[PDB]
Design a protein around this ligand. Sequence first.
Ligand SMILES: CNC(=S)N[C@@H]1C[C@@H]2CC[C@H]1C2
Length: 209
Amino acid sequence: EVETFAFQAEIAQLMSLIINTFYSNKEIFLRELISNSSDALDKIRYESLTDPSKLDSGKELHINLIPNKQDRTLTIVDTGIGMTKADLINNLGTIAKSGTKAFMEALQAGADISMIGQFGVGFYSAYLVAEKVTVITKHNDDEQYAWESSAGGSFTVRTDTGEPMGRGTKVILHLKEDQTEYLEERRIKEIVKKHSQFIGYPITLFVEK
Ligand SMILES: CNC(=S)N[C@@H]1C[C@@H]2CC[C@H]1C2
């Protein structure tokens, strides 16, 4: 079922800093998640050039933004390369240790949280607006997995039994109560056009009721 892991001490520090620091420019989280999505889409497109079989799990390379007001969730779906089990628990956390160390020294020097992406740890800016983050992912060499955390120093991983994704990553943001503005269409449009206008993949914004 569900395995529980401790964050590395430095990543827990980062999440606590992002969660507790007073910083009003929260909308930068979307640019970071979209940029992470566009990087995962580049990687699968480059790999499929020398091996077209990597696209049997889906030829489309796009990003979907799905707001859900009934669940108070904002979901970022990309059909990129996805992540394996070792990526969730070990590989990506080892890379993020040096980026997090460099990010804290830059913050002590006068930098601000909006520059989190320049240090490779941009995903954690989801905790500017989310009380809990679910990450569903499927890589060609592994099974589908669900990653989840509410900060507090721990995260969980389980094998996902939901709808199969084919290939890619789905980030579900369970928004905090005062951040429901990022479920509105005109608001998401404003943030995309301002921060992600030149992404080289179709960004389709879903609408609701
Ligand atoms: C680019 N990915 C980063 S920065 N982090 C990883 C994504 C998932 C959440 C934490 C790990 C697993």
